[PDB]
Design a protein around this nucleic acid. Structure first.
Ligand SMILES: NC[C@@H]1O[C@H](O[C@H]2[C@@H](O)[C@H](O[C@@H]3[C@@H](O)[C@H](N)C[C@H](N)[C@H]3O[C@H]3O[C@H](CO)[C@@H](O)[C@H](O)[C@H]3N)O[C@@H]2CO)[C@H](N)[C@@H](O)[C@@H]1O
Ligand SMILES: [Mg+2]
Ligand SMILES: [Mg+2]
Ligand SMILES: [Mg+2]
Ligand SMILES: [Mg+2]
Lengths: 138, 125
RNA sequence: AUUGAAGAUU
RNA sequence: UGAUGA
RNA sequence: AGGCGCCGAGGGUAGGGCCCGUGACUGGGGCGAAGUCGUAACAAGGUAGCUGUACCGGAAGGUGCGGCUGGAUCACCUCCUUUC
RNA sequence: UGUGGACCCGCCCCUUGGGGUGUGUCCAAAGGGCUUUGCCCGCUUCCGGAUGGGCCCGCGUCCCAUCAGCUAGUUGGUGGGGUAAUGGCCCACCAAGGCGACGACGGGUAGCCGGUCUGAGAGGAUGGCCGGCCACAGGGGCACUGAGACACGGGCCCCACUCCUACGGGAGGCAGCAGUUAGGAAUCUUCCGCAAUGGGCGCAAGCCUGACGGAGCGACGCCGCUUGGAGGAAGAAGCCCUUCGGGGUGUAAACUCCUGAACCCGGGACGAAACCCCCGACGAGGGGACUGACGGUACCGGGGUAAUAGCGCCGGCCAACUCCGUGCCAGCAGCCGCGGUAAUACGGAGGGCGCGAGCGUUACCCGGAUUCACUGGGCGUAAAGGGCGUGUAGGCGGCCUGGGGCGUCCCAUGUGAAAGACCACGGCUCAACCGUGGGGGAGCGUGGGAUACGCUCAGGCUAGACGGUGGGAGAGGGUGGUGGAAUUCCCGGAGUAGCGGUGAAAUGCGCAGAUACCGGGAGGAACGCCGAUGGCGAAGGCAGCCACCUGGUCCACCCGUGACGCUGAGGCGCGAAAGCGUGGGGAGCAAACCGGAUUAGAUACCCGGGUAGUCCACGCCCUAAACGAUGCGCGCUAGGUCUCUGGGUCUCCUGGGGGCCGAAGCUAACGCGU
């Protein structure tokens, strides 16, 4: 049935970038969108937009890389080095504000969902609230 | 295992076994001898190794090594036992403490004197 | 006696 | 079909 | 006061269940340089091996049935690779 | 006597038996001292406070499922009884219930915690001293008294022990301080004091206090200190090495000066100001006196002696090397391993490393061990995918909107005793030890708030799933029927001397005529070619042909339902071969077995026979190299080529199977790779 849609997205994304695709559809959900917004803003993706395919709502995700590279193996560095689900249907994961993780001494993000909406970790910390720890990303 | 699985069965504590029923934990036990046989080692080792059959305050009767140059033990000898396998002699897992009870210390012993149980000698000392 | 030394061999 | 211990 | 009664620690006889002991007789098992019989296995190990099962034999085993390749060598094959 | 309180009935407020009120009824007391008419210590009723407790409830609290069912006061009820008080706490009567895979019941083990040790942390381990709670006082019952006990030094009884006994009967209970004895590897003085603190009685003076404050024994632990300091040779002797030159112990000793642990003399504590008495007023406040176990100790001053070193280790891990001895011996040994005549590994010695009033050993706990993996592991060949399905509980659940706010998050607040821990500053000359102060803190309770995600309720969608219509391929299964080839036997023909079998043989069969050949018959079992690198099934597995009964599945159409999904502990079903039971069948094959060869032997390989069995029906068994040695579903991530089977606009395009090569990636490698 597809059991964790948000896992899915992270994975679709993880997969498309390692073969350096320009873009990936992922079937669209409001929540998925909210996570994408962060990705976009935090400068991990170029951007994203709604689209249809076979006339059902998707989300094209435009991915983003580094420059062509030095010697044998000219593959660009990845912008999204690591994108990992934390909370999962098997095991939900929640943090109080005092215990939100700091991803790769701040060079990374942790999307995290609160009752004040979906936020990066600094975002959440600032508005002094915690919630479901969605994924890390660096 | 899945996490549900760990919720269902959990992990299992690796709780493991003594090498030395000198029973009641006890760092030493008192026994009385029975045989003072000699034994051949195994492996690639050849020699005539000193051993006693010891009947213990544990209730237990077991074989123990008699370390050092030469002993003074026979049938009714009455001795303290300490644990320490021999390793060349499978089924020998306890040493006899030398210098306690009816086990003489090692006569003429200069170096690792504290094991072997031999008093500080007097020479130019 | 033989063997590096032994077991075995007279 | 066999070729003693280290 | 005294008496009788119920309850009641405990005890008895019958009946089961269960734990320790010791145990005549009895089954294998581990470990111990150079004892005995053969030679199953590892190379196609000299009958390819392993396997469940079933019978049989000092011993390893052997044989029956079915299965497996986790089998050597030679062929025909088609696949791949090779071009072109 | 009735301030009042108790109880019944009523009424009011309040809400489980909480307050209030009205009749009625019922219930108090003790005296003592005196600095004697006015005070002190007491007594009685009642309302409150304070402290201490009982009872109840949520959550948490070890091992075994090789313990799976348990339960008659059992579960509830109505009415009693009992208590300070709720309650099957107990009793009568009624009802038939309560509990359990979220682990009841049973077994094992165990006092629980504050803490402690360890760890980076999560965790593991633990509960000795100190503080808190519980339980017990030779073992087992039980009540009495009392505010309180069902009472360690109170009582009764039963039991086991010891003691006294005039044999009838009696006494007793160190898990209080010492101490004895036993067990054991092992654990202290039959000490000193009520001076302090605290406790009981007393108006007080006081008395009691093995609580306690000290001292004593034990390197058991922690901390502080000593066994000297500065000189002092190109460097004594001895000992050890030695290429015979020398090298080492070694500034180490000797020896010069200096200081002065111990020990001696002198002084000498704080800890103790209260109770009490006097003044005041028995108040506040002021004055006064008594009192030290530790102890002639600590500490201060004077004098003053060069005055203790041990244990472990030196193959690698692991810091530290040489000579003898020894010859797989004697021995070492945490693991790996040393020793067989040149041993840095044994024993000794010189020298060296390490620690030092200690050093080693053994036992035990955590560590390292991401080696039970939550943080943080794995299962193709290393240990590990269940033989396969079906689907029970359970776990998990697509897209949109709204309610609720259980999870989750936030603010406030209560709680989290002291000790300990951590930080500061203090007191013992330092430190150990101690004092004071500060700062953490999960968990839980209360109040308020948020609503993204999870949950739930209500609506909605069609991308998951299911269905409809139309088409397909298939050794998928079951039942009945039938076909030809071959083998065996039987009957007839013709026909003659061997056939068969092997490496070579022989056993065997043949003149009762076999082998080979032709014709007829019976029977059982298996299906050649097609046949594939092919297909079908969840697996096991499925192959002549025909009918019938029946399972799955693929494509197109985009028509219906509207998340109906995935997985699946247990259960149930299926499950090759061999084997079991009952009854059939029996051609060929063939364990066992009977022979022939072979061989050193041959309980085998080869050869001739042969029973079970192989076959059928029905019932069992439930195993396997039950294999892709690879659980099931879904999503995502280059391609090439071969192939089976659909559809299309038919070079090709597009589904669903089967293969190989191999992007990215993965893997210890081999490999794997829509
Ligand atoms: N170990 C389990 C089973 O034990 C058996 O092993 C036992 C005996 O069979 C085997 O015996 C061997 C013998 O096989 C070999 N052919 C001769 C040898 N002397 C024997 O040796 C044995 O016994 C001798 C006394 O003589 C002891 O010295 C020695 O420790 C032991 N290995 O030694 C084992 C006892 O030590 C199987 N042989 C063994 O392979 C199998 O695994
Ligand atoms: Mg050999
Ligand atoms: Mg040897
Ligand atoms: Mg592992
Ligand atoms: Mg394996």
């Amino acid at each position: 049935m597809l059991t964790d849609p948000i896992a899915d997205m992270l994975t679709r994304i993880r997969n498309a970038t390692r073969v350096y695709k320009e873009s990936t559809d992922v079937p669209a959900s409001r929540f998925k969108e909210e996570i994408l917004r962060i990705l976009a803003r935090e400068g991990f993706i170029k951007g994203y937009e709604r689209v249809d395919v076979d006339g059902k709502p998707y989300l094209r995700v435009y991915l983003k890389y580094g420059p062509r590279r030095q010697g044998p193996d000219p593959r660009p560095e990845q912008v999204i080095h690591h994108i990992r689900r934390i909370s999962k249907p098997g095991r939900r994961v929640y943090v109080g504000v005092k215990e939100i993780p700091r991803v790769r001494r701040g060079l990374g993000i942790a999307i995290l969902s609160t009752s004040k909406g979906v936020l990066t970790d600094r975002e959440a910390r600032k508005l002094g609230v915690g919630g479901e720890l969605i994924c890390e990303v660096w | 295992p899945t996490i549900n699985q760990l919720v269902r069965k959990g992990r299992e504590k690796v709780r493991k076994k003594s090498k030395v029923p000198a029973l009641k934990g006890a760092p030493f036990r008192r026994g009385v001898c029975t045989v003072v046989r000699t034994v051949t080692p195994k492996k690639p080792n050849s020699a005539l190794r000193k051993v006693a059959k010891v009947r213990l305050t544990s209730g237990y009767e077991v074989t123990a090594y008699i370390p050092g140059e030469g002993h003074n033990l026979q049938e009714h000898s009455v001795v303290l036992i300490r644990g320490g396998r021999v390793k060349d002699l499978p089924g020998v897992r306890y040493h006899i403490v030398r210098g306690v009870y009816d086990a003489a210390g090692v006569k003429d012993r200069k170096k690792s004197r504290s094991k072997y149980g031999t008093k500080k000698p007097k020479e130019a000392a």
